[PDB]
Symmetry: none
Subunit: 413 residues, 4 copies
Amino acid sequence: TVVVTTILESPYVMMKKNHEMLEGNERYEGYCVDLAAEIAKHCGFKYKLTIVGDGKYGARDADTKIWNGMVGELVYGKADIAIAPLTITLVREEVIDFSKPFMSLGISIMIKKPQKSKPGVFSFLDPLAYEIWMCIVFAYIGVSVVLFLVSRFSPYSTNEFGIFNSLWFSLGAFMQQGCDISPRSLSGRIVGGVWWFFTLIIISSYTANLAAFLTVERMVSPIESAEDLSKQTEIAYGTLDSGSTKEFFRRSKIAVFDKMWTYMRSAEPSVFVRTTAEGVARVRKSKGKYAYLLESTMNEYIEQRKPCDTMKVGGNLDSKGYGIATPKGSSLGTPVNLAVLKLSEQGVLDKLKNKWWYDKGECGAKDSGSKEKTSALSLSNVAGVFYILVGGLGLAMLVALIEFCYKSRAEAK
Amino acid sequence: TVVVTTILESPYVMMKKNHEMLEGNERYEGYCVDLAAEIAKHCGFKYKLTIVGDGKYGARDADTKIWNGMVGELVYGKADIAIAPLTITLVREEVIDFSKPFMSLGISIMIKKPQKSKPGVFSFLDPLAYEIWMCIVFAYIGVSVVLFLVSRFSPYSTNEFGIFNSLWFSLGAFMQQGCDISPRSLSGRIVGGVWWFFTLIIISSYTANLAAFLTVERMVSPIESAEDLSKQTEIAYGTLDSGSTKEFFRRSKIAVFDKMWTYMRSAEPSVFVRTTAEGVARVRKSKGKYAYLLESTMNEYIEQRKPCDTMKVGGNLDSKGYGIATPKGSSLGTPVNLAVLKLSEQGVLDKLKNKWWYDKGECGAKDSGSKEKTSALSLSNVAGVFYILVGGLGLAMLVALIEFCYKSRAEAACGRKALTLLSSVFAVCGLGLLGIAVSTDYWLYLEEGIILPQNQSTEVKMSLHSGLWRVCFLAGEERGRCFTIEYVMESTVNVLKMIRSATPFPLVSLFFMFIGFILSNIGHIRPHRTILAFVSGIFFILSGLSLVVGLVLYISSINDEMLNRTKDAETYFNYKYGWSFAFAAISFLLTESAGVMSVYLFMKRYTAE
Amino acid sequence: TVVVTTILESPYVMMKKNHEMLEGNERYEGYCVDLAAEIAKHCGFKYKLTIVGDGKYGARDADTKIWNGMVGELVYGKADIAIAPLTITLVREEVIDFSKPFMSLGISIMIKKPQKSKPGVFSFLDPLAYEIWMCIVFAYIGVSVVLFLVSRFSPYSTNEFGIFNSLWFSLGAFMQQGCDISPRSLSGRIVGGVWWFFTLIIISSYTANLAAFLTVERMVSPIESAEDLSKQTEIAYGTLDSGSTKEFFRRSKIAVFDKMWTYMRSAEPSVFVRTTAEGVARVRKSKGKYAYLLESTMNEYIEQRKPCDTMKVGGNLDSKGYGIATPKGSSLGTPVNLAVLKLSEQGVLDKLKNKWWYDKGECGAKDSGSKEKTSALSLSNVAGVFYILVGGLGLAMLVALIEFCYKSRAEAK
Amino acid sequence: TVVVTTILESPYVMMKKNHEMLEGNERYEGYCVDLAAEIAKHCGFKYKLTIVGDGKYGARDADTKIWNGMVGELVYGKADIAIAPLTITLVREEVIDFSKPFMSLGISIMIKKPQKSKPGVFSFLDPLAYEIWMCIVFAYIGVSVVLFLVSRFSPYSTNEFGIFNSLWFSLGAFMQQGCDISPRSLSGRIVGGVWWFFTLIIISSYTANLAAFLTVERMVSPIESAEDLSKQTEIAYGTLDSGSTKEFFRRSKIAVFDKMWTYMRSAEPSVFVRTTAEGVARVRKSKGKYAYLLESTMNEYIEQRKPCDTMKVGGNLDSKGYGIATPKGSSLGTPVNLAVLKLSEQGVLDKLKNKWWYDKGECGAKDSGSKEKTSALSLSNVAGVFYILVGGLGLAMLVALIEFCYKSRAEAACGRKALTLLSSVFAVCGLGLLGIAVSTDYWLYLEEGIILPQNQSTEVKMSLHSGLWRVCFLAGEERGRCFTIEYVMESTVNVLKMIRSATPFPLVSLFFMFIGFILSNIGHIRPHRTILAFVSGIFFILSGLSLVVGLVLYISSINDEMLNRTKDAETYFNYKYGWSFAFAAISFLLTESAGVMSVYLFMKRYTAE
């Protein structure tokens, strides 16, 4: 009767563990297998599934114009019905008829799930912004100068506040340490009064936000909704060859899409890859270097199956449709055409969409909820404080030598 | 000639600077109007534009289902061809003809993009309450004076703690920055000891509650995944009605979408809005209380127009399409259908799709420069700490100039005469302002009332000022009761019983200045045998310590009754201290200062002996 | 045909806002109204709802044996069918027949939702337990004694460490303050070394947990699962009279239930109350003093309708059933009996249970999620630190007087 | 005579101390056995007990539905009356006769009641890592020696910073408790300045991460409401099969219950357990990884028996009933049915229901004394801080006794001779132990492997020790490669490239002691013109500072590669430092100490000049 030309892709058609055990036509299962079984029995015919294992979705090729895989069986007439995740396009439509779309999808960007970032060397000063650390050092100099200028005028023979000691008094006040010298005037002690109140807020502010950083973790979304793709050029975009995602970016006319296809041709080495499962694996080996653009409902499934290290970003960048491919003027097409619309209008198809993607198990708020213990700080989190310390240790020894020069040139005294 | 129907929706159809001056189809301008000329010339028919009367897209009711909108204009024979952002759905597919889609689109949430409220300049002191900072300074004055009275006792040697030193020790101890010297006496170490235990808890409490603010601020997550939009009833969400967004969520078979239509049906008031511009405006007014569901292409254009206060969250919830539509039986429809694809195969659809969208870059790319995700404090957080620091330096220069002038004149009897009279003035003003304050019944205000949400702000229901002896009721039902606390009249009377818990301590403080000033009167007549002045000064110092206990008893007895209200969002609350509270707080300053001066009166006059 | 004797209780039967506007028999609505409409139409008859407004559920009374309310209409035959939230019991069964239960419930304890507690005067020392604050003071004395005994033996004429100063050195080290004296021996400085490391952990530990208290709020469940009821005797239990919850505790035989009925009779003044809505209001005026035991599915509804200040605690303490009451040897009972079981076996009844309680709106994780801003500390939260301070201020003045006694008795020197 | 069938379930049917010795129906004992005698005497029939062969309650399969269990014993005519905790359901109601319920009950979750793990005695230092506390002490030694070399320079007056003072200043500065004196020199203020900035960050980092521990500990909520049980896949939940709990969740119409049966059907392995005792035992073994669904009455009895490690959470999910059952057509059933109600109307049901339940109070009411909800720290949290405090005091007394003896002998040439030789021994041991360490390739261990969940613990897959110059591979596939880092062979090789990033700093440190000891050899021959000894001591002090940079470069380059692993729970990891890491760390201590002694060699011998 009918010969089903299709490919197995999770979760459309899958290979059951009952391969050698269960014989017959129920050895392969999936969302596409039920909808093929629904479309055949409401029409009346019965299915002969066979998967040509070349793997190519297929487009009309360059310089030879050969339909590669499932389309090649469907064009040359060696199979009759094609229930498969196959895209309806213009060059696809002209050779052979199509049904109405299963669901609505788009070209979807797939990346590695963001992790804990590499802690920077100077990442300890993250709780306070750049303008505050400048205004702390600027006010450090300013309060020291005002304390210096105050202490000169007022004797009430030992004025212990030089400009060098006034820097030292305010520095020890900033670092919560005790200083031996104290101001001995009403005009001086007000400077010590407001500067001590300056430190008590800021040091508590640094402790508060650093507690806020370690308690609540917030990971960056590196590339968002394809305008951030257009500017960031450290990542390598990736798509599948012999398919619709190849030819649509070849058909780029939007300026943001024209930026892509220039880089998609001019790149190294992944101009294209050959399997979505290879593309899933290439993302998981990338660790942020590479992204693989693919079908949206394919992208949604891999994020729900639980290695959990993949993330769909933004939204769809196109609109495409999965329809039952049929020969041009099919023996079965118009009965399939109404019965595809019949399953949609009573929500059996959307129930099948609810069925297959939900039952596989989820990776959502369940692991983000209570699979965290907050880690101890590593050496990397506070590494630069050691470098400033030992860098201060070497710089102190350098000024020790320049002191020996100026002390010895007391010579000819 | 043909008829072209449109809906007045930005940016597809726009108005003109010559809204009434200009002629013909050139009355309007827009993406669809430019698209309609493209459909016209390639096919070969002149077009006359028309407008739908109602301004709604298309509605199918449980009814005779005459579509109220552009569709019924298009079906029943008023109009010929529609050039509009009409959504292609299967319900509309069976009743009219659609071409291939000329644009790709989806449902997208538009929320109010959160304007950062730059906080108060003095927002650093928000972890503590303003009553606490009042009680810290009241404790700072008291510990300095008590350490003065401990140190400067009558047989005391080499005890350097004057009042200027005792003020400087407690300020150094409170800031944890060390100090010059330590008290070399057993009672001096006790007052230093409890103050060290005081400053340990308060700074640790301030650091911990400031950590409590910043963790709760980071735990707040903006709603973007549309499951957060479904589960958060604090943000209300509605759609444009008589369209396709209302149709999509109605017959949906996604469980999160099912709860959305369940919410949007049974919501009150009717969240459905008949036009997009008012639906944008409800997001603007609500300040993030309301959200709006619409197409993605409309959401992007409203974003890049410049109020720049609306952002798109999440992604396309589905992928529908826009298509030029003709009724069943139109001979023009198949020449229309290939003409749309003809404009597709040269990008003339996509050239116009770029043109109106890039040209409105009037927003200045606010999204480009304001999404660097940063949770560090800004200078707007700790601004007043710099402002106190600047105000301290300019004050200290002002003290430096007056000290420079006063020292030159002094180096180029007065102490005894002026200080005796000035402490005498401070004693009467201290006793009098508290005696007014206990008599006055304007201690605390309350304004219980009920909130009002939208087009609607607030409504008071009850008000009373209050006193320590007796209540005196206010403009709630205009009942002028000075009704005693023993005489009842709820939670507000429960406050009034708890106000009575702090009754004796001001009356105890009133007695100690009363014995304080009268013993001050005795030494003013006869200066000799000078013991009584030092005794009287102790009664001044111990008086203010009781009033510190009096205020701390009073304020804590208000704050728990504030907390004791069952927290309903609809019943707002107000409370405020009064002039007599200021009369008592000022009387604390005059009483302790007269306590210091009367010891200096003893120090000068024991030398006179 | 049939006359429905029942009472309106939310959400069983409710009064619609379309009272004067909508006439006919749809002026009252609810879960019980649908199930009455389901049981009547599958049997064939049509309903005449009328609510005898006396309010009593009714039991066979003391000393007169009168069936009070809905049972009185059902016993004396002035009404025929009774679709109502009525409990099936022995004395109920003997006079008139009953159907199979709607749902399964129990006697359920209802309390005020716990709030922020009153902060204690000495609640500042909550982050560290009782054993630590003893071991801090015990080690405060111990390290001071060891520092005292060390400094006596080693000159390398001015031994500045007395027992009084050694207490003062370790106290200033505990309070993060700077002390003027310093140890001047290797045996002494080790004592200052480990004591300084003692304070740095503990003061940071106090700051860390007090931040943990203010960030995460955790409110006590005061009384849990009816054994904590049996021991706590500051709360007043409450039930409704003229009903099943009255008579079941009268039928107490379990020892934990025998504790209840002694207190339920011997109390003041709420031995019983007269309305569940009065009992809901009495809990909301109680603020923790009083609890109202009631029907479980009634208790579940009030917690979902949103004043939100009620909480069901623990679990059910009994099992009871809501059935359609029928006359003894009813004209309709056995057709009702099968059709009650018919609605249960195909889950229409459980769908009606899903319908009415869910649609009213919820008060769950939605307000606990993001309707919190953490408050500023009040004066009450740190109140006792002021009392210890001013209590230290008065105690310092007392030792100032006892110093004057011992100084003046240097007399006869 | 009649036949009575039972299931061996606690506490309803129990065994006997005479398991085989005693005779008849008295072979067993229990609540149902005592209930069966009550049914016997009031009706008037003698009873013979029997046991079901399988031990399952009752199963209805999609099958011929012969009930496999006590029901099929009761239906088909093997047994007459059942006295058992059989649940009354509508499926069982149509096939046999049930009396009125004699007990009320519900489904209740039993989880493992969490045993508190009393933490490590030194668990206070858990916010930082043990590499950090190693680097703090390494920085503490270095800053003290550098401040010594800065202060004790050759023309220096009155500079009191000896090495015993410089050790005491940095310890006072690190603990933020103030200090005795401050460095009165410009280079001395620099080394004090960066150390003050060091101790500011580390203490604030320790306080913040300790706050991070206690907030995350409080955010963990135990699963009790059964919606948390449904949504948390980390705790697996299953039921007793062939009963009524399996039947109830199967055909349920509650949406949270629907996901439960969806989970319990498709779970792997089969969570259904054929007996309750093994179903209790799976909760015991899993240590809170597994949960069990059962009746409330069985859950309470297992709780009050004393392992006391199982608690009940939530409430009764429904309210089913237990009833004495007879088949259809039993003449005894209506005399049975009124006899159950006869025992109800005297509480004889309820008297027996009290009796077995109060008598097993062997648990000692663990729930009564362990649910005072308390989140304060215990002494078990900060225990080692007391233990360090106790160990410090006993050490200080030990220093006090030896100082008392040494001072008496000394008060009742030696410095120059001993210190010169001891620094010479320390120099060779410092250079030699590092030279072994650079040569040795046992720096760091790794054990990559895969976990195993249950009846199953761990399995290694790969192992390698490693060196700075070259790797030397280990028992992963038994391949003895001392394969150089330039020669590749994944994430573990990515570690090996990052180990090479810290290569020069130990080799730089190896050169500086090599120039250090040789310049030390020159002064040993000729003491005169003593400048070179002070120069050589600087090369010792600067050598250890480079090795501090060498270790900090090395340790940070390991920790990020630890973090760089994609975190899979199934692939566990191990890492550990080696003997050569200890050889380098010990060599730091000898190098800085010889740096101090060679300055003292200069201080003594400049006095000799």
